[PDB]
C-alpha cells in the first residue's frame, strides 16, 4: 500500500534511505503501519522533534510498552501470562535505585579496571594469531559474556549464556522466526529464571541480579527476580554485543581515524561518543504512547496513539550534524541520541561506556587491524531489533 511499512529492514550498518526521505518531507511526524502487527504508528526522524518528543511528559514509555498498546514489534516481549513491567516491578518493591546504584559510575569505577584488563588480554591474544580471526567471535562475545556475568546475573555458565542469547536473538527480531517462535523464547527466558535466578543471585560478586536480590525493602517476589533477570538480558545482552561488534565494523573501516587515536589516545572518549552517534545499532524505534491529546510540531496526536522516533534517522540529520554521514572523532556537535533522551535516557549509559572506551583502546592501541574482507561482505543477522554481524573476519 502507499503507507509505509515498518521497519525499513535495513539489518546492515547502511541506514535505510527512506530515514532520510522522511526527515526532509513537509511532513514532522509521519505515519506508518506495523509490518507485524497492522498496527497504526507515527514516526519521527528529526532531531529537533525528537527532543520535543522525548522531554514531553505527556508521553509515556510505559504505557507504549502494555499489552494492546500499537506496535512495531510482531510478538509482546513479555512471556505470556507476565507483566512485563520489570523497571515498575522495582520501583513498586522499593528498589527505586538498584539499577542506577549497579551501573553508575561508582559501578563502573569497581569493573573499569578487569574490563580494560580483558578487553587487552583478549586484543593481546589475536595479536599472536595467524592469518584470519573473528573479532566478534574472539572478542566482542568474550568481553560481553564476561560482561553479562560479572555486571549483571551472576556467574552463568556456557550453555546457560547461550540458551540466554538464544532467547534474545530469537524474541527481539521484526522477522525470520515464526510468531510461536518468538513466543516460546519469552516463555524459555522467564522459566529459566523462576528456575535459577535465586541460585545465581546467591552466587559471589557485585552482579545487579544479587543487588536487586539482597536489596532492603515484603521480599521480592520469584515472579519478581525472574522479571529483573529478563530485563538484564534484553536490555543488556543484545545492546553491548550488538554495539561493540557495529563500533568495531566503524573502526576497520576509518584507519585514518584510529591512526589518530593511537597517535593521541586522549582523544578516545570523544571517539566513543561519536561511535554512539555514528554507528546505528536498532533497527526499530524508541516510542511513546501519547496519554492524552496533544500536538508536537503541529501534528495532532490522539490519546492512545503511538509517536517512534528512529535514532539512527535523528543521529544523521544534517541539520543538527553538518555532514551526519561522515565518522568525525573530533565533532563538536550536539548531543547525540545513541543512548536516547530524557527520562529514559539508557540507565546504563556508563557502564556502556565503559566497556565502548575500552574496546576502543584496545584497538588503537595496535597498528595494523584490519577488515579481511570487503564490508559488502559481512554477513548481518537478518531481522534482529539490535543489529549484529554473523562474524567480523581480520587480520593484522
Ligand atoms: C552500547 C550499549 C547500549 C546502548 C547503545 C543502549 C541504548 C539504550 C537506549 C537508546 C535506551 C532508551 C530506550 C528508550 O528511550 O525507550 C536504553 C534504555 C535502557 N538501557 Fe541501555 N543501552 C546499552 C547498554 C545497556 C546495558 C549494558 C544495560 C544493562 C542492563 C542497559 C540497560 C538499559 C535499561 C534497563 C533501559 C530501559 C530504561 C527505561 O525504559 O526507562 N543498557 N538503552
Ligand atoms: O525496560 C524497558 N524499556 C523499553 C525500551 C527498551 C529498552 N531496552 C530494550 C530492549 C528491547 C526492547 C525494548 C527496550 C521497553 O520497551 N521495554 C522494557 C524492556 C523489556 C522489553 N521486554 C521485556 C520483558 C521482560 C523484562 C523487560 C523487558
Ligand atoms: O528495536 C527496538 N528498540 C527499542 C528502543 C531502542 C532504540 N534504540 C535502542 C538501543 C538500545 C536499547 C533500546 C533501543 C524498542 O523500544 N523496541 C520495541 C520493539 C523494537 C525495539
Request: aromatic share 6%.
Given at each position: 500500500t502507499a503507507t509505509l511499512t515498518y521497519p525499513f529492514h535495513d539489518w546492515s550498518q547502511e541506514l535505510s534511505p527512506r530515514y532520510a526521505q522522511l526527515r526532509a518531507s513537509d511532513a514532522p511526524v509521519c505515519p506508518v503501519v506495523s509490518e507485524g502487527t497492522g498496527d497504526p504508528l507515527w514516526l519521527v526522524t528529526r532531531y529537533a522533534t525528537a527532543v520535543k518528543l522525548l522531554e514531553d511528559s505527556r508521553f509515556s514509555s510505559e504505557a507504549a510498552q502494555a499489552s494492546g498498546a500499537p506496535r512495531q514489534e510482531p510478538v509482546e516481549l513479555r512471556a505470556p501470562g507476565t507483566r512485563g513491567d520489570a523497571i515498575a516491578m522495582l520501583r513498586e518493591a522499593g528498589l527505586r535505585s538498584v539499577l542506577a546504584d549497579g551501573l553508575g559510575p561508582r559501578a563502573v569505577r569497581r569493573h573499569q579496571g578487569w574490563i580494560n584488563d580483558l578487553a587487552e588480554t583478549?586484543?593481546?591474544?589475536?595479536?599472536?594469531?595467524?592469518?584470519?580471526?573473528?573479532?566478534?567471535?574472539?572478542?566482542?562475545?568474550?568481553?560481553?559474556?564476561?560482561?553479562?556475568?560479572?555486571?549483571?546475573?551472576?556467574?552463568?555458565?556456557?550453555?546457560?549464556?547461550?540458551?540466554?542469547?538464544?532467547?534474545?536473538?530469537?524474541?527481539?527480531?521484526?522477522?525470520?522466526?515464526?510468531?510461536?517462535?518468538?513466543?516460546?523464547?519469552?516463555?524459555?527466558?522467564?522459566?529459566?529464571?523462576?528456575?535459577?535466578?535465586?541460585?545465581?543471585?546467591?552466587?559471589?560478586?557485585?552482579?545487579?541480579?544479587?543487588?536487586?536480590?539482597?536489596?532492603?525493602?515484603?521480599?521480592?517476589?520469584?515472579?519478581?527476580?525472574?522479571?529483573?533477570?529478563?530485563?538484564?538480558?534484553?536490555?543488556?545482552?543484545?545492546?553491548?554485543?550488538?554495539?561493540?561488534?557495529?563500533?568495531?565494523?566503524?573502526?576497520?573501516?576509518?584507519?585514518?581515524?584510529?591512526?589518530?587515536?593511537?597517535?593521541?589516545?586522549?582523544?578516545?572518549?570523544?571517539?566513543?561518543?561519536?561511535?554512539?552517534?555514528?554507528?546505528?545499532?536498532?533497527?526499530?524505534?524508541?516510542?511513546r504512547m501519547a496519554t492524552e491529546d496533544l500536538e508536537i510540531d503541529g501534528v495532532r496526536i490522539k490519546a492512545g496513539e503511538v509517536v517512534m522516533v528512529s535514532l539512527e534517522?535523528?543521529?544523521?540529520?544534517?541539520?543538527?550534524?553538518?555532514?551526519?554521514?561522515?565518522?568525525?572523532?573530533?565533532?563538536?556537535?550536539?548531543?547525540?541520541?545513541?543512548?536516547?533522551?530524557?527520562?529514559?535516557?539508557?540507565?546504563?549509559?556508563?557502564?556502556?561506556?565503559?566497556?565502548?572506551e575500552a574496546t576502543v583502546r584496545a584497538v588503537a592501541r595496535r597498528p595494523g587491524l584490519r577488515l579481511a574482507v570487503a564490508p559488502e561482505e559481512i554477513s548481518w543477522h537478518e531481522g534482529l531489533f539490535f543489529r549484529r554481524p554473523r562474524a567480523i573476519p581480520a587480520t593484522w
Open positions: 583478549l586484543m593481546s591474544e589475536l595479536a599472536s594469531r595467524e592469518g584470519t580471526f573473528d573479532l566478534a567471535a574472539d572478542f566482542v562475545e568474550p568481553l560481553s559474556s564476561a560482561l553479562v556475568s560479572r555486571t549483571l546475573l551472576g556467574e552463568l555458565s556456557a550453555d546457560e549464556r547461550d540458551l540466554l542469547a538464544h532467547c534474545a536473538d530469537t524474541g527481539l527480531r521484526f522477522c525470520g522466526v515464526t510468531h510461536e517462535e518468538q513466543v516460546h523464547a519469552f516463555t524459555q527466558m522467564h522459566e529459566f529464571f523462576l528456575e535459577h535466578a535465586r541460585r545465581l543471585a546467591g552466587t559471589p560478586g557485585e552482579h545487579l541480579l544479587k543487588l536487586i536480590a539482597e536489596a532492603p525493602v515484603g521480599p521480592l517476589s520469584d515472579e519478581a527476580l525472574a522479571e529483573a533477570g529478563s530485563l538484564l538480558v534484553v536490555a543488556g545482552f543484545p545492546t553491548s554485543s550488538g554495539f561493540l561488534c557495529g563500533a568495531l565494523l566503524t573502526l576497520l573501516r576509518h584507519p585514518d581515524a584510529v591512526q589518530e587515536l593511537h597517535a593521541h589516545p586522549e582523544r578516545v572518549p570523544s571517539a566513543v561518543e561519536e561511535l554512539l552517534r555514528y554507528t546505528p545499532l536498532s533497527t526499530g524505534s524508541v516510542k534517522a535523528v543521529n544523521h540529520d544534517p541539520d543538527a550534524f553538518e555532514d551526519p554521514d561522515v565518522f568525525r572523532p573530533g565533532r563538536e556537535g550536539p548531543m547525540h541520541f545513541g543512548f536516547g533522551r530524557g527520562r529514559h535516557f539508557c540507565p546504563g549509559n556508563r557502564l556502556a561506556r565503559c566497556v565502548i
